[PDB]
């Protein structure tokens, strides 16, 4: 970046000495910090959980948030929509008219993240499978299975609402949830 | 003797530019670290419970 | 030295059904550590020295 | 005692003990971890004579022959009484009632 | 109403009132502070029959 790399200009950066190493240390610390940030956010579980092959959860339709196995990305329709709405400008790949990533020739490269998109999607899938099949039990110990209407009846007691409010309106609450998830893609 | 002071002017320009870029990257990295700590806290307290 | 794709975690399928629940019969009192910084070393710099 | 999940260690928080450290503090988070679980057949409600019965604090579980009320985080089976349950509605509206 | 200890003032939190301030906000945290305690002899359980 400083010198044209076809020259003895680099023989005068030794007169300053410890400055470029200080940037390389600082940017390395930033990069390791970003990988640590992704690891702290998404690696909340030590086990990769899966949904049962029969996706019936008392009338609650999770097909727009669970991963779609018919696509090679192994992502949900919402996640496949989210990656399409971000005009991503990274250059974390080996592959070499010119675009904005011709700034690599001035010494400005982009390092790829430690966790790929597929591994973050698998962490998200494990978190979703845990919170659907086991409630809050998998986050404070071993995963304990529970019916999802029974899970939602536990979650209604956490807001001061009795259990019979859910069970006498289970179809209504399932329909409201399925309508509200479907409006997320439209929004 | 004259190309040296001309390139010393240019090299000090590139030194200042790189130090400025790394200072903004450290500030934005602190902001992204705060946002990621908030995201991990929201993951643990909204998703896991 | 070997290189490998990282193992993302253990594999566990939760035995879900519409009329089965798992309840623990025992427990474990667990103590874990959390090391977390508070202060850093206070430095003073003389200008002319 | 914090109800925030994983804010004070992994598990259900009971206590924490601070310890002095060089330029920092070390917390010893005492948590409650469930262990040794068993599979039980459950039901949302019990139908006695036309009334629907729901647990006041616990959960209806079955060992295959008899139904019990136990607390949610520890297996402790109890006889289903009107002291353990409350009555709301009838048996025609709850999906999965037994 | 917050169950977080000392997040909304010292004591058992009941209410809080915001007030406008120059370049800031002032909260008036209404907390419940116990007072005038008395010693008693206690027991973990009572055995009847």
Curated annotation (Swiss-Prot), chain D:
Glycans are attached at residues 39, 63. The lineage of its organism: Viruses, Riboviria, Orthornavirae, Pisuviricota, Pisoniviricetes. The gene is S. This is Spike protein S2'. Disulfide bonds join 47-91. Subunit of the fusion protein that is processed upon entry into the host cell. Mediates fusion of the virion and cellular membranes by functioning as a class I viral fusion protein. Contains a viral fusion peptide that is unmasked after S2 cleavage. This cleavage can occur at the cell membrane by host TMPRSS2 or during endocytosis by host CSTL. In either case, this triggers an extensive and irreversible conformational change that leads to fusion of the viral envelope with the cellular cytoplasmic membrane, releasing viral genomic RNA into the host cell cytoplasm. Changing residue 66 to Y: In strain: Theta/P.3. Changing residue 36 to H: In strain: Kappa/B.1.617.1. It comes from Severe acute respiratory syndrome coronavirus 2.
């Amino acid at each position: 970046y400083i010198c044209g790399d076809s020259t003895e200009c680099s023989n005068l950066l030794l007169q300053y000495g410890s400055f470029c190493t200080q940037l390389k240390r600082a940017l390395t610390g930033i990069a390791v910090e970003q990988d640590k940030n992704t690891q702290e956010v998404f690696a909340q579980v030590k086990q990769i959980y899966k949904t049962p092959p029969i996706k019936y959860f008392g009338g609650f339709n999770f097909s727009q948030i669970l991963p779609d196995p018919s696509k090679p990305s192994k992502r949900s329709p919402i996640e496949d929509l989210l990656f399409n709405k971000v005009t991503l400008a990274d250059a974390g790949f080996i592959k070499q008219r010119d675009l904005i990533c011709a700034q690599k020739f001035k010494g400005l490269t982009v390092l790829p993240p430690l966790l790929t998109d597929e591994m973050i999607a698998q962490y998200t899938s494990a978190l979703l499978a845990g919170t659907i099949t086991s409630g809050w039990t998998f986050g404070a110990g071993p995963a304990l299975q529970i019916p999802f209407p029974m899970q939602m009846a536990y979650r209604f007691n956490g807001i001061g609402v009795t259990q019979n409010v859910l069970y006498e309106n289970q179809k209504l609450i399932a329909n409201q949830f399925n309508s509200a998830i479907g409006k997320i893609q439209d929004s | 003797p004259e190309a040296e002071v001309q390139i010393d002017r240019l090299i000090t320009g590139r030194l200042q530019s790189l130090q400025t870029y790394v200072t903004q990257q450290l500030i934005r990295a602190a902001e992204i670290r705060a946002s990621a700590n908030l995201a991990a806290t929201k993951m643990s307290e909204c998703v896991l419970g | 030295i070997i290189a490998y794709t990282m193992s993302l975690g253990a594999e566990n399928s939760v035995a879900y059904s519409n009329n089965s629940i798992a309840i623990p019969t025992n427990f474990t009192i667990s103590v874990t550590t959390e090391i977390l910084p508070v202060s850093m070393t206070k430095t003073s710099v003389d200008c002319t020295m | 005692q914090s109800k925030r999940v994983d804010f004070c260690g992994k598990g259900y928080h009971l206590m924490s003990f601070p310890q002095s450290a060089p330029h920092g503090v070390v917390f010893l988070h005492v948590t409650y971890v469930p262990a040794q679980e068993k599979n039980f057949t459950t039901a949302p409600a019990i139908c006695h004579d036309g009334k629907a019965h729901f647990p006041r604090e616990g959960v209806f579980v079955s060992n295959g022959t008899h139904w019990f009320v136990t607390q949610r985080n520890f297996y402790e089976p109890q006889i289903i009484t009107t002291d353990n349950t409350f009555v709301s509605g009838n048996c025609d509206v709850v999906i999965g009632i037994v």
